[PDB]
């Protein structure tokens, strides 16, 4: 029913279990608005590409399969890009390269090649929605922490009054740079595998 949707959130998480999909998590999580827009875009692309590839799964020749799948995914992402530039211009500028990097994002291609090729139209859309849900969960957690501790804002609203505007808080500088996303995702994986100890890896 909804188990196929709600599994990838914590049980089989893309960014936390099957390493697929790390670059956008590292890049776009400096701001919660960009993180949310990227979450929605990846859900959209994954779901629609799964649906269409599953619809035409039986006629795709194995010799040029990659070309067909990348054509579908690139068309979806190009349409999404031309729609972002027209309605959200302030966020597209901040997402410039990773809006187009959804094509080479691993979640989309992995769920197209593994599940969509050997499944049904409707459940493929469902699997895409679930994978996007997990991906967006990770994105929004890391973005919440980075935007709250690095600038004192959330979606653009001052929650912690900075020390320039006569406030008590002085923002962190690492939460706008490279290593903070790595550290946050590592401690997130720690906190996940502390509560679900069946994901812990073998010793040697």
């Amino acid at each position: 029913l909804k188990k196929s949707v709600l599994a990838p959130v914590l049980d089989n998480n893309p960014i936390a279990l099957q390493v697929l999909g790390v670059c956008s998590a590292l890049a776009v999580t400096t701001k919660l608005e960009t993180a949310f827009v990227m979450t929605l875009a990846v859900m959209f692309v994954t779901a629609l590409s799964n649906f269409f590839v599953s619809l035409i799964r039986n006629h795709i020749p194995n010799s040029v399969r990659i070309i067909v799948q990348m054509a579908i995914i690139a068309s979806l992402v190009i349409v999404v890009d031309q729609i972002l530039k027209a309605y959200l211009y302030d966020i597209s500028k901040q997402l410039s390269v990773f809006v187009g990097l959804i094509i080479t994002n691993c979640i989309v291609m992995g769920r197209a090649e593994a599940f969509a090729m050997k499944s049904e139209p409707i459940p493929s859309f469902i699997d895409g929605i679930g994978n996007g849900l997990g991906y967006g969960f990770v994105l929004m957690t890391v973005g919440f922490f980075r935007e709250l501790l690095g600038s004192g804002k959330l979606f653009g609203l001052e929650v912690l009054p900075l020390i320039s505007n006569g406030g008590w808080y002085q923002p962190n500088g690492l939460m706008l740079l490279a290593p903070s996303a790595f550290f946050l995702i590592g401690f997130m994986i720690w906190a996940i595998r502390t509560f679900k100890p069946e994901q812990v890896e073998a010793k040697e």
Binding site: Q170, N172, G173, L174, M175, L177
Partner: peptide
Amino acid sequence: AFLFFAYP
């Protein structure tokens, strides 16, 4: 390096 790049 934490204190240098965080509170600069």
